[PDB]
Amino acid sequence: NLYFQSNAMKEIVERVKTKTKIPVYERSVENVLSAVLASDDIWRIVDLSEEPLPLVVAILESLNELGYVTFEDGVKLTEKGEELVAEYGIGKRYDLQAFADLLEQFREIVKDRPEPLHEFDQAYVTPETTVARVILMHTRGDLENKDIFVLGDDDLTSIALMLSGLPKRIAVLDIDERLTKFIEKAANEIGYEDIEIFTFDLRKPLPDYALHKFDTFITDPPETLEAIRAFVGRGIATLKGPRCAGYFGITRRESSLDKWREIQKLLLNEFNVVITDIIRNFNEYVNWGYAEETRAWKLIPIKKLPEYNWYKSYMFRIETLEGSRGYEDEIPEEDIYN
């Protein structure tokens, strides 16, 4: 009954499609509406909706253009919007202390960390996240007397790993030397001898001293399929063989579920690994001034900064098995193993 049925959703979804190439579903819109029922704060709406930020903005713009939301007092539904949610039955969106010494020691050290710099795309997690990560990895048996490779470390996970006393050895690669220098200084104050800084071109083949030498890697790659395949491809190639662990963050803030599907296909068909854990909002990022640089910032006439750490990622854990593989050499443009 196309003649009498509500054409509201379809109308909204078609308008969203003129604003973004991210796949738009009716539920993308419902997710945002559900978030708006819970909160008039745009950062929280993005958080609660678990849709990528540019899709949320495009959805909020479309709903505004069509009379469903106003930005005059945070983000709120109009009466037309209140009628929309009622019609479609859209509900309001509902949502470490044993290692307390580690956390105190970690905060003590990183209070003087080098300033995050836009030049190095530096966004890092809270001290509570870092320490929870260590605990989590320990509960999976991936730390104690193990060899850890930390690919990029603006989170300063290597410091928390050293403070734990658990790993046999740790190797860290980071493009920002202020970090590696700080890590080495920290290692000295901690008395942790078995720290190495790797400095090599990630574009070029892995060197023998990083090829198949680690039990566990951890990394937090940029949010593109191309960067993930490079960072995880390279991390897996640093792993000794079967039954080694990889840890990395993937966000709903910047990657759609269609993009997640491609990532997971990469993992299983390209790298032929298994996913043991996908833990929602495990990673909480310290506000670094990212909000003000987004389109969301321009959306609400009165500017308001995030009240809390709205930017979060899921923790993925992967494990190698017989036949797993990474990229030892040149990183390819397309899938080569699949």
For 40-107, give the secondary structure using H, E and C.
CCHHHHHHHHCCCHHHHHHHHHHHHHCCCEECCCCCEECHHHHHHHHHHCCCCCCCCHHHHHHHHHHH
Nearest to 236 by CA among 191, 206, 200: 206
Query: Per the annotation, does 154 bind a ligand?
Result: yes
The one among 15, 93, 234, 312 contacting a second copy by CB under 8 A: 93
Q: Could you count the other beta carbons within 10 Å of the beta carbon of residue 177?
A: 12
* 313 DSSP β-pair partners: 283
Cβ 171 to Ca ion, closest distance in Å? 15
What DSSP assignment string belongs to 303-337?
----SS---EEEEEEEE--TT----SSSPPSS-S-
* CB nearer a second copy, residue 50 or residue 153: 50
Q: Diameter of the chain by CA atoms?
A: 75
* CB nearer a second copy, residue 37 or residue 159: 37
Nearest to 105 by CA among 136, 130, 141: 130
Report d(CA 127, CA 144) in Å as an integer: 21
Where does 191-252 have alpha helices with state H? 225-237
Report the site for a second copy in 238-277 (rule: CB under 8 A): 242-243, 257-258, 260-261, 264-265, 268-269, 272-277
Report d(CA 41, CA 62) in Å as an integer: 18
Cβ 201 to a second copy, closest distance in Å? 32
Q: Is 337 in the site for a second copy (CB under 8 A)?
A: no
Residues 95-134: x where in contact with Ca ion by CB under 5 A, - otherwise, as a string: ----------------------------x-----------
Within 158-286, strands assigned E span 169-173, 195-198, 216-219, 245-250, 274-284
Query: Total residues contacting Ca ion (rule CB under 5 A)?
Result: 3
Q: Is 174 in the site for Ca ion (CB under 5 A)?
A: no
Cβ 89 to Ca ion, closest distance in Å? 6
Cβ 244 to a second copy, closest distance in Å? 8
Task: Select the span of 55-63, 152-160, 191-199, 317-325 touching a second copy (CB under 8 A).
Answer: 317-325
* CB nearer a second copy, residue 89 or residue 301: 89
Q: Could you count the other beta carbons within 10 Å of the beta carbon of residue 66?
A: 16
The one among 154, 176, 270, 319 contacting Ca ion by CB under 5 A: 154
Residues 95-124: x where in contact with a second copy by CB under 8 A, - otherwise, as a string: x-----------------------------
Residues 123-142: x where in contact with a second copy by CB under 8 A, - otherwise, as a string: ---------------xx-x-
Report d(CA 79, CA 85) in Å as an integer: 10
Residue 313 identity:
S
Query: Per the annotation, does 123 bind a ligand?
Result: yes
* CB nearer Ca ion, residue 168 or residue 303: 168
Nearest to 29 by CA among 55, 7, 5: 55
Cβ 250 to a second copy, closest distance in Å? 11
Cβ 300 to a second copy, closest distance in Å? 24
Contacts of 190 (CB under 8 A, 6+ apart): 159, 162, 163
Report the site for a second copy in 12-31 (rule: CB under 8 A): 23, 25-28, 30-31
Can you say which residues are annotated as belonging to the binding site for Ca(2+)? Answer: 123, 154
Can you say which residues are annotated as belonging to the binding site? Answer: 123, 154
Q: Which residues bind a second copy (CB under 8 A)?
A: 23, 25-28, 30-31, 34, 89-91, 93-95, 138-139, 141, 144-145, 166, 168, 242-243, 257-258, 260-261, 264-265, 268-269, 272-280, 319, 321-322
